[PDB]
Amino acid sequence: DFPYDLNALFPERISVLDSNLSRPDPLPQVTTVIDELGKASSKAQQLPAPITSAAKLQANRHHLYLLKDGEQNGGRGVIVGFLKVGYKKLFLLDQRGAHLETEPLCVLDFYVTETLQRHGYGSELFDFMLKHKQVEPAQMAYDRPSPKFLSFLEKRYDLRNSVPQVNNFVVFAGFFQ
Numbered sequence: 823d824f825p826y827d828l829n830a831l832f833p834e835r836i837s838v839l840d841s842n843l844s845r846p847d848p849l850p851q852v853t854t855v856i857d858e859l860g861k862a863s864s865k866a867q868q869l870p871a872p873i874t875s876a877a878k879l880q881a882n883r884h885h886l887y888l889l890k891d892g893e894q895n896g897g898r899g900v901i902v903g904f905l906k907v908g909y910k911k912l913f914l915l916d917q918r919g920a921h922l923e924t925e926p927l928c929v930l931d932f933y934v935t936e937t938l939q940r941h942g943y944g945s946e947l948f949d950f951m952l953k954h955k956q957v958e959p960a961q962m963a964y965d966r967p968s969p970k971f972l973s974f975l976e977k978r979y980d981l982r983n984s985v986p987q988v989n990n991f992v993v994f995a996g997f998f999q
């Protein structure tokens with residue numbers, strides 16, 4: 823009968839949603855918060871339409887990491903941001919301009935509120951996945967990273983010298999070494 827509060831939908835600080843997005847049926851709620859966050863992320867960037875949504879997540883083998891700050895809002899919790907990850911099949915150019923058919927884990931979407939940015943939240947999201955997915959920053963690819971994410975990557979994981987591509991993904995020297 824009574825609509826779930828944020829703490830019932832997402833008990834943990836970091837929540838890992840699947841293709842199966844997971845009193846009433848909670849899915850209509852979970853759906854909304856994913857679509858909202860998707861539009862927010864898509865609007866922060868100058869994107870035509872959202873690249874992240876409840877629908878899209880149901881179609882693909884991606885992982886969505888939700889970070890809920892439990893103290894905010896009287897202790898009901900608030901969603902500060904998310905990080906979406908999945909395996910794309912890519913033809914990347916190595917340092918000699920030869921295409922390499924590979925299928926790395928990629929950062930597909932990544933967003934924190936416009937305010938509350940430049941707090942430890944993005945770094946915590948990233949650090950979580952990395953341990954969960956058991957992977958290094960350098961061995962994974964990045965779908966059209968923004969200036970801020972490139973700043974983020976360089977200062978957190980020393981990722982600096984990007985190997986030239988043309989398919990709007992980004993990999994670093996260490997990706998091949």
Ligand SMILES: CC(=O)SCCNC(=O)CCNC(=O)[C@H](O)C(C)(C)COP(=O)(O)OP(=O)(O)OC[C@H]1O[C@@H](n2cnc3c(N)ncnc32)[C@H](O)[C@@H]1OP(=O)(O)O
Pocket residue numbers: 866867903929930931932933934935938939940941942943944945964965966967968969970971973974975977
């Ligand atoms: C793969 C994709 O689709 S890209 C999607 C990413 N989204 C965007 O491009 C729009 C902007 N990005 C976002 O909205 C994301 O939620 C982010 C970037 C805010 C998440 O990162 P945050 O957690 O805010 O970064 P955080 O505050 O932890 O800062 C980490 C470090 O990166 C640097 N950094 C982060 N954001 C920025 C920025 N906008 N400008 C300059 N430097 C930045 C900082 O220097 C910081 O280190 P320092 O403060 O010690 O120097």
